[PDB]
Design a protein around this ligand. Structure first.
Ligand SMILES: NC(=O)c1ccc[n+]([C@@H]2O[C@H](COP(=O)([O-])OP(=O)(O)OC[C@H]3O[C@@H](n4cnc5c(N)ncnc54)[C@H](O)[C@@H]3O)[C@@H](O)[C@H]2O)c1
Ligand SMILES: NC(=O)c1ccc[n+]([C@@H]2O[C@H](COP(=O)([O-])OP(=O)(O)OC[C@H]3O[C@@H](n4cnc5c(N)ncnc54)[C@H](O)[C@@H]3O)[C@@H](O)[C@H]2O)c1
Ligand SMILES: O=C(O)C(=O)C(=O)O
Lengths: 333, 333
């Protein structure tokens, strides 16, 4: 197959350091799919990039057709098929994802403008840098010639985190848990919804509530754990998550590239235009979706209880607030 | 279908951060091999170690059955099926990763002692932390009940780098290169030998001397390039060569676990007793081996030309010296 052009921004940083190996080894786009890898970062990090290039050569990765290290937008965004937007200022212990907004939203406006100008119209754009949803939304709106649908942000890490807490609670495997949902914002108001989740017990596959038999936990400690998870990792490590962040990016892009498995949906921040869940349009909200032929579709018919109604509305409300701040700031100049 | 117990020491830093995902991924011990990862680091790094533990859980790895974090030797080394020894004292620019001997060999003396008392007798121990060969030797000497053959250190990174250099020189792929050999010490006197090595050049296996047609380069710049590679990545990145080291450690441990491909030998530091290559007995030196049923076997009968003889001998002298220096210290008290 002809090579696909995949860009990873902030390529000299931690997340990228934990991710380039998985792209180059074929575990993301396919064991036989060659990659033209494009690596963007700032001028003073170009020497770090060169160290990463020698390490890629020392890792035996033949699927890497070419590896382009650059600090130029013209080169970085040209003809891409995939854009992994990581390049961003990370928060530190004590900060919410919301400060970083003014600092980072400006970067995603220019990058959305760079995609629109230089990348293919078919590009898949994956936004990881914080605030992901708002960053996501801003970049998307500075790329009017690229379908809204090609813009996604990462809630897969929160998804994976929710599964790992279920597996640990029930003493099960991560793969035995399925259909946990991460609704709304990639922030501490995220709703990790296990109402439609399934767990494989030895006698039969049951609902997560039925298998846990602890409603308080599921609506209490379980919610807080997942929500504060990013902040807890930073508090311990003194660095943002990277190993777990990179892996969720691999899972998110693979599910885009290869589709979701029969009877299963995954969490994805996407544009909310047309949803049927009572969520305002024009937001970059995380929904449970099924993917096929690289195209996502929100899962419909999920029964929403009262407890889930509220929670879902609180993340949307929070997302509107971030939308208001970033748009006031980017127009003001 | 039961799990195995693997220890990774120095779990709170660089190399381990790039390596643990590949262990719990199933890419080392097999896609149906469940693992319990045991992470060991010193007391002051327990904060950071808990965040790595959180990241590991957050990757949602079905095979990763349990993850344990401790600063206790009695917990780390209990009932291990595999021990990866990374923890140690660091290196950097200004040369060569020589002086570290006396500041790292105490660590490994202690660590062999714990394996001796707590570890299964069948443990496989891979020594990575520098001085790799001499730390290796010290640990085996302080663990007299665990078979000396069960101990090995890592020359696989130098071996992997060597293949990439040949691939680069010729314009071919790294996996088109077979049977390079890393003779000796993991240091600047190492001997990266290609006399017995093969390359697939234009769909025909030929002989790397035959393919390269530049004997001066193979005996000059290739050798120094492979010996100075680690220092070039570290001066470019300002951080260790973790991504490539993580990959060479997986190579080394997978080949131990599942054996070498038919027709192929790999490089790995082992106990020298009885070799037929003119190298002193009771040394931990790298040789070419074939591996079957988790048991290495030095490849006998390779003709040693004169250039090779002073080089293998030169590496040996250095290793003899490090042996002197390490043991007088440790016995001194
Ligand atoms: N959505 C998620 O789950 C998620 C998870 C983890 C981290 N993140 C976020 O991802 C972002 C990436 O930071 P990190 O964790 O890798 O830490 P990091 O600081 O080590 O890496 C960031 C990299 O971005 C580069 N960079 C900065 N501005 C840039 C620009 N304008 N163009 C290109 N590159 C630029 C930096 O030089 C650096 O190399 C942070 O905002 C972090 O909070 C998001
Ligand atoms: N053989 C090879 O090919 C090779 C290649 C690269 C690096 N290395 C060596 O690997 C080692 C690890 O490097 P790194 O980049 O991860 O360094 P690092 O600083 O990032 O990590 C070392 C870790 O060892 C821990 N440690 C120190 N003493 C310990 C002890 N007694 N018990 C347990 N943990 C202890 C430290 O607290 C730290 O967490 C170094 O010795 C490095 O030179 C070997
Ligand atoms: O730390 C953060 O901001 C994250 O988004 C993360 O680690 O998932």
């Amino acid at each position: 197959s002809e090579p696909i052009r995949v860009l990873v921004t902030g390529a000299a940083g931690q997340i990228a350091y934990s991710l380039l190996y998985s792209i180059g080894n074929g575990s993301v786009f396919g064991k036989d799919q060659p990659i033209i890898l494009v690596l963007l970062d700032i001028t003073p990090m170009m020497g770090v990039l060169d160290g990463v290039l020698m390490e890629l050569q020392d890792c035996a990765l033949p699927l890497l057709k070419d590896v382009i290290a650059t600090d130029k937008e013209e080169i970085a965004f040209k003809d891409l098929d995939v854009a992994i937007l990581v390049g961003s200022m990370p928060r530190r212990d004590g900060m919410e994802r919301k400060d970083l907004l003014k600092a980072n939203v400006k970067i995603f406006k220019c990058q959305g403008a760079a995609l629109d100008k230089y990348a293919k119209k078919s590009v898949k754009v994956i936004v990881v840098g914080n605030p992901a949803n708002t960053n996501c939304l801003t970049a998307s709106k500075s790329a009017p010639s690229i379908p809204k649908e090609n813009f996604s942000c990462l809630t897969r890490l929160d998804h994976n985190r929710a599964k790992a807490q279920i597996a640990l609670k029930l003493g099960v495997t991560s793969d035995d848990v399925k259909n946990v949902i991460i609704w709304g914002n990639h922030s501490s108001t995220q709703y990790p919804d296990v109402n439609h989740a399934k767990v494989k017990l030895q006698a039969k596959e049951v609902g997560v509530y039925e298998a846990v038999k602890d409603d308080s936990w599921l609506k209490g400690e379980f919610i807080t754990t997942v929500q504060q998870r990013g902040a807890a990792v930073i508090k311990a490590r003194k660095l943002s998550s990277a190993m777990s962040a990179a892996k969720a990016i691999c899972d998110h892009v693979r599910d885009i590239w290869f589709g979701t498995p029969e009877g299963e949906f995954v969490s994805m921040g996407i544009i909310s235009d047309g949803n049927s869940y009572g969520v305002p349009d024009d937001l970059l909200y995380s929904f449970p979706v099924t993917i096929k032929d690289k195209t996502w579709k929100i899962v419909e018919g999920l029964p929403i209880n009262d407890f889930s109604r509220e929670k879902m509305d609180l993340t949307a409300k929070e997302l509107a607030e971030e939308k208001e701040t970033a748009f006031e700031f980017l127009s003001s100049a």
